[PDB]
Each structure stands twice: as structure tokens, then as C-alpha cells.
Amino acid sequence: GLDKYLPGIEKLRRGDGEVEVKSLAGKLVFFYFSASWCPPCRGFTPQLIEFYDKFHESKNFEVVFCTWDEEEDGFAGYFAKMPWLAVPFAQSEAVQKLSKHFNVESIPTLIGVDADSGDVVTTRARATLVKDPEGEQFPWKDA
Hints:
This protein is of the alpha/beta class.
């Protein structure tokens, strides 16, 4: 499923260690494209954290941070403030190619895919989440 999006990546960052991508079986996976330098990301990130804390278990999803930062040494610091997963900084090429695959032209952007099938569920969750904090229309399926 996720192989399409992260070709040959087996592990993702979580806190100070890693998890296997296999642990995402059955979940909806949101790729969160953001960066420490991005002005609109500052206000969006805490809204996403609130939604994640409330619903990641009950609505069975995960968030994978896909960085647009180009300084590693800030990466630790920026990801440290998030509760979810991340593509490792050294796998930035995979992030860039994923950004292109999804035609991400600006950040923040939040795209949800089904882990098992790889199917795209929503490409507009950054816009829809701010208008639906209780997730009454989650997962905001694309037409």
C-alpha cells in the first residue's frame, strides 16, 4: 500500500526512535507537508495536534510528517514538537518525490491515503480540518 508513496522505506521516526511502516496496517495515513520556516504552518500545526490527540485512535489514523526544511539540525527540534511520525531527514528525496506526486505547491498540506490499498482518500484535509475540528465529516473524502 504505502510502497507507492515511500518506495523502499521500512522505518519512520517516532519520538527518539523508529517504527516499521508495517505497523500502519489498516490505518488511514495522513502525509503532513510542513516546515519550520513556513508562516501558515505555525498556526495550523497545533490544530492538527489537537485533532490527532482527540481522534488518532478512535478514527484509526496516523500522521507522517514530510518535511520541507532543508536544514537537518533544525529537523530534530521541529519534529520534537509533534506527537506523530516522520520520514527521516535523510529520506528527503522520497519526500520531494511524494510532494511532486501529489502536486503539493504550497504548505501546509495534508493528504490522506489508505495504508493497505494505497488509495487516495483526501487531498484537502488541511482546509477541511480547520472547518471541522470534531471530525464530523472525516475523512473528508475527495469527490
